[PDB]
């Protein structure tokens, strides 16, 4: 039960990756993939708590 | 994994699987290694799946 909205790149090496990524540091956000041509187990559901 | 860092930045560190940053205490049972030299136009074509 906490919120986190961060666009800063999370480093995964030794050099400080404040704004440079591509060699050894990864972006912490990735996109979803929802195609109708996918399987039944790869379909998006609109879930509410 | 100290040999991974002091051998210059790598062009293509992109990979699918467990991140190497959390392999400090994750002891395994069996592991093998092998190397080869291939054209860089298909270095992105070496990936699982």
């Amino acid at each position: 039960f906490e919120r986190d909205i961060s666009t800063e790149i999370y480093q995964a090496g030794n050099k400080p990756c404040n704004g440079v990524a591509g060699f050894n540091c990864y972006f912490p956000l990735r996109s979803y993939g929802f195609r109708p041509t996918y399987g039944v187990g790869h379909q998006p559901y609109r879930v509410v708590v | 994994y100290s040999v991974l860092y002091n051998f210059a930045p790598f062009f293509a560190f992109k990979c699918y699987g467990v991140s190497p940053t959390k392999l400090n205490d994750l002891c395994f049972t069996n592991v093998y290694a092998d190397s080869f030299v291939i054209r860089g136009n298909e270095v992105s074509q070496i990936a699982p799946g």
Partner: antibody
Amino acid sequence: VQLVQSGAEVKKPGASVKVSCKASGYIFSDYNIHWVRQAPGQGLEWMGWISPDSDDTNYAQSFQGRVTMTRDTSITTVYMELSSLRSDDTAVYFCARSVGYCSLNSCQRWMWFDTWGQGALVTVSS
Amino acid sequence: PVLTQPPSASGPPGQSVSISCSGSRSNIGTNFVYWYQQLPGAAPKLLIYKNDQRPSGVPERFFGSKSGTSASLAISGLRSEDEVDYYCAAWDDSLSGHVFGAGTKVTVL
């Protein structure tokens, strides 16, 4: 696919252009359309993107009051309205089909333009 | 701001010519760069996306690369179609809009 649009002739400054990029070869509910201009010599300039299903238009930080958007569904076109033009950006306008649907500004990370509309020579002169 | 590009990195045909696309800290280095192919006096089109894969119909001879803050595209040999301009572009969080290149022209010798 086809991204055909009409060609507006020379118009005096202080009016609004009228060009419609007709959508064909796909469904008009999932593909974001983008509008750019290309002055000779220099590169390209980005204006904005239009949601095909709803009126959710986000504009750039270059032009805000000059450019105003509206959309339609039954005709399956797009309306251009550039009020108070100035004779300093005589450029050809292109409509570029981009794969993927997104509504927020953070979506522009895995976005590219696959096909672009053909040339429509549009300028302003007296 | 705008991406800095060389004016004309031309090269003779028969050997590879390297082109560079240097940006800023926020313009590139956190997002993915794209390279756009345009015929002279015609509409542009995309050449490569996400520095890893190419669209269908795009020849394998082409290749794209990045250096953390500068993007590089590799072409080996020039032909009757390789006398065209190369554009480099990406997206940035500083301006919350598209950032496009300046312009580069390559010609045979």
